[PDB]
Design a protein around this ligand. Structure first.
Ligand SMILES: Nc1ncnc2c1ncn2[C@H]1C[C@H](O)[C@@H](COP(=O)(O)OP(=O)(O)OP(=O)(O)O)O1
Ligand SMILES: [Ca+2]
Length: 269
DNA sequence: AGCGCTACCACACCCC
DNA sequence: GGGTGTGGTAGCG
């Protein structure tokens, strides 16, 4: 109840035959989610970075299908982000990154593989869920200085109550590595200034977290997220949709497969 | 006209 | 000297 108060109190201050199409832009994030409620269509909220170098964002509301239609060519709608709605069920995902200069002998492949091998073990012990690297969409946005990878888990009929509970799960199973201010040593890496922190970014599990979309780049640079070469997740091939659209749907954190046997995973801190 | 939030420091308090 | 709860802005993500 304390969260919805900050949203309502910020709102009072902020105010002081064509084919079926839905394409609404909103200056405020709250306005977008309000429209989603009074919509009835399977619509979702995206965030676009404005030409301003800062993180100033505008919020687009439309379906996953229509969005990809005006987005697949990559001539327009660059620097887009998925708004992971709070309280909404979502997939297990990761934001992985370390500074290459400050970490000479850190192999990016073995680190992500060992990380997956560990989380999969954790999913088995705590929740009985079983999966392997074959269920992990591996994306890359690395440069010559930053090894940047996004992992989106594609679990069979499983999801988390929301992204906050995802964070409680990772802080829990990554506590052995958090103590290093289960041999989770490969997680520790030297940051920008040689300070030792974790290979896993635990700051992407907040309410209404933006998350850069598949084939999008930050407004600054020009390196877009793309599927790695060692990725082991392959969507099912369908004749009614393109393979790129399959990866796009898989990459969406808040696009949980509709299933009549869905298990919702929770985790309190 | 983005939206969330904690890492950090400062202070106030208590304890034998 | 240690230890614990409270503000409150700067700054990351
Ligand atoms: N100023 C911001 N405002 C809102 N959301 C942000 C902001 N900065 C980062 N985020 C969100 C979107 C990002 O996809 C998410 C992860 O942060 P970040 O690591 O800086 O971007 P990224 O991981 O997608 O690219 P990369 O790590 O390769 O630089 O946090
Ligand atoms: Ca990142």
């Amino acid at each position: 109840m304390n969260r919805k108060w900050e949203a309502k109190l910020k709102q009072i201050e902020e105010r002081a035959e064509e084919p079926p199409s839905i394409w609404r832009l909103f200056h405020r994030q709250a306005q977008a989610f309000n429209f989603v409620k009074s919509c009835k269509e399977d619509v979702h909220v995206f965030a676009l970075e404005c030409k301003v170098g800062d993180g100033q964002r505008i919020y687009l509301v439309t379906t996953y299908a229509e969005f990809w239609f005006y987005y697949k060519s990559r001539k327009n709608l660059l620097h887009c982000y998925e708004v992971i709605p709070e309280n909404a069920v979502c997939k297990l995902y990761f934001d992985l990154e370390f500074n290459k200069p400050a970490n000479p002998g850190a192999d990016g492949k073995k680190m992500v593989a060992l990380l997956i091998e560990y989380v999969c073990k954790a999913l088995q012990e705590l929740y009985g869920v079983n999966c392997s690297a074959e269920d992990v969409l591996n994306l890359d946005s690395s440069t010559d200085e930053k090894f940047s990878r996004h992992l989106i888990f594609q679990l069979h009929d499983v999801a988390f109550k929301d992204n906050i509970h995802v964070g409680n799960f990772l802080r829990k199973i990554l506590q052995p590595a958090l103590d290093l201010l289960p041999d989770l040593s490969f997680l520790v890496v030297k940051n920008n200034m040689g300070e030792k922190h974790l290979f896993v970014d635990l700051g992407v599990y907040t309410r209404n977290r933006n998350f850069r979309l598949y084939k999008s780049s930050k407004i600054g640079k020009r390196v877009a997220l793309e599927v790695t070469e060692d990725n082991k997740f392959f969507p099912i091939q369908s004749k009614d949709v393109s393979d790129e659209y399959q990866y796009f749907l898989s990459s969406l954190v808040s696009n949980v497969r509709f299933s009549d046997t869905l298990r919702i995973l929770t985790c309190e801190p």
